[PDB]
């Protein structure tokens, strides 16, 4: 309870129930995330443990701040800083008008900063999608929902492939080759980058094989001259329909030269050749970058 009262319910999903709560007397708004305890055990889910443990050691202006953890035997509340809305709702709200390129460049810049911070601290987010990206009224965007996030410093750990909704899942994970690392997060941002320009999902697949097929028609069917070990991959099939690569204005018309360049680098099939967040921050696509204010 304390000073704060729930003012409205933001959303309710598998993660739990997220409320918008505010304080009288001072005027502090916070996001109150109630965690759904396990069925058999009534214990804290592994996702909540990882999210809280990771966000407690991660402090960055482009990463959502964990304020406090209310821990009682029956309930578990997560107090986050409040932001206006997620990126997806903003893209849907701008679907007909369009998002100005300086704002797109700004968002991508900040996202790459926060992602670079996570990667330097040996942390994978693994769930980069527009609804997990929160924005405010003053032009800032932050990474949120670290439920599927984890550290990768410790060697030979077991990993999973249920990482993110298919639309933003890297082709390395789709082909079942697990051992993946930082590159998959970059891929997601690459997809989100395109979705910010055209206000339309780049690879809208309904299954793993469909997701792969859409990625193929857009970027060309991978061979071993572009991806050295693509044919020896567990879920690779020789019956793959071969498509040629498309030109990047037939893919994303409003971009400029440096724009297609960066997007082409972020969507590299080979994870070893895919750009890092740090190297992306030094790309010639963040030269006149500024921090415009969005109209919400």
């Amino acid at each position: 309870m304390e000073n704060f009262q729930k003012v409205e319910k933001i959303g309710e999903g598998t993660y739990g129930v997220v409320y918008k709560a505010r304080n009288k007397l001072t005027g502090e708004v916070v996001a109150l995330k109630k965690i759904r305890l396990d069925t058999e055990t009534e214990g804290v889910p592994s996702t909540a443990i990882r999210e809280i443990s990771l966000l407690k050691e991660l402090n960055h202006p482009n990463i959502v701040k964990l304020l406090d953890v209310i821990h009682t035997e029956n309930k578990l509340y997560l107090v986050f800083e409040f932001l206006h809305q997620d990126l997806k709702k903003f893209m849907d709200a701008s679907a007909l008008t369009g998002i100005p390129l300086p704002l797109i460049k700004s968002y991508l810049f900040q996202l790459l900063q926060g992602l670079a911070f996570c990667h330097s601290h040996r942390v994978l987010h693994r769930d980069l999608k527009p609804q997990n990206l929160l924005i405010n009224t003053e032009g800032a965007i932050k990474l949120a929902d670290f439920g599927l996030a984890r550290a990768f410093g410790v060697p030979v750990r077991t990993y999973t492939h249920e990482v993110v909704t298919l639309w933003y899942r890297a082709p390395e994970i789709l082909l079942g080759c697990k051992y993946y690392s930082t590159a998959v997060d970059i891929w997601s941002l690459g997809c989100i980058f395109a979705e910010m320009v055209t206000r339309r999902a780049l690879f809208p697949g309904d299954s793993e094989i469909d997701q792969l097929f859409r990625i193929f028609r857009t970027l060309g069917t991978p061979d071993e001259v572009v991806w050295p070990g693509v044919t020896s991959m567990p879920d690779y099939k020789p019956s793959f329909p071969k498509w040629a690569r498309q030109d990047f204005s037939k893919v994303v018309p409003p971009l400029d030269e440096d724009g297609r360049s960066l997007l082409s680098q972020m969507l590299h099939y080979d994870p070893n050749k895919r750009i890092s967040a740090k190297a992306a921050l030094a790309h010639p696509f963040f030269q006149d970058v500024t921090k415009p204010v969005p109209h919400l």
């Binding site: 009534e42 407690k56 050691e57 550290a151 410093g153 410790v154 060697p155 077991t158």
Partner: protein
């Protein structure tokens, strides 16, 4: 070396049997066995609190944090609770959550900290539990 109070647990009979059971080191890796010591010091456990149940809840917490393969760590439930583990593990997990609260939710252990606590006594056999493929 605080580690002495960590090493007494690994002279226990049923503990050694638990290690012997985990051949592939799926839940009792050297890094995991290092993280549970980190948890012990972070919780500021007294010599009094170096129980077997605290070792198991700390190990389970370590698996919860660093291992995505969620099902193998369930093998911990019998050794800590007995043959009636199927009706004793919610309380075990409650104790894990209590330990997680006690360490102020700093369940994340960097590799550097693991190498530091594995450097005090490289002689001990628990650090040769390497895992491969």
């Amino acid at each position: 070396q605080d580690m002495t109070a960590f090493f007494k647990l690994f002279d226990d009979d049923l503990i050694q049997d638990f290690l012997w059971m985990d051949c592939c080191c799926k839940i009792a890796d050297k890094y995991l066995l290092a993280m549970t010591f980190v948890y012990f010091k972070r919780a500021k456990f007294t010599i009094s609190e170096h129980t077997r149940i605290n070792f198991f809840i700390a190990l389970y917490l370590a698996n919860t944090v660093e291992e995505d393969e969620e099902e193998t760590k369930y093998e911990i439930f019998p050794w800590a609770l007995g043959k009636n583990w199927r009706k004793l593990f919610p309380n075990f997990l409650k104790l894990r959550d209590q330990l997680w609260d006690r360490i102020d939710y700093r369940a994340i252990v960097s590799r550097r900290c693991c190498e530091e606590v594995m450097a005090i006594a490289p002689t001990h056999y628990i650090w040769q539990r390497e895992r491969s493929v």
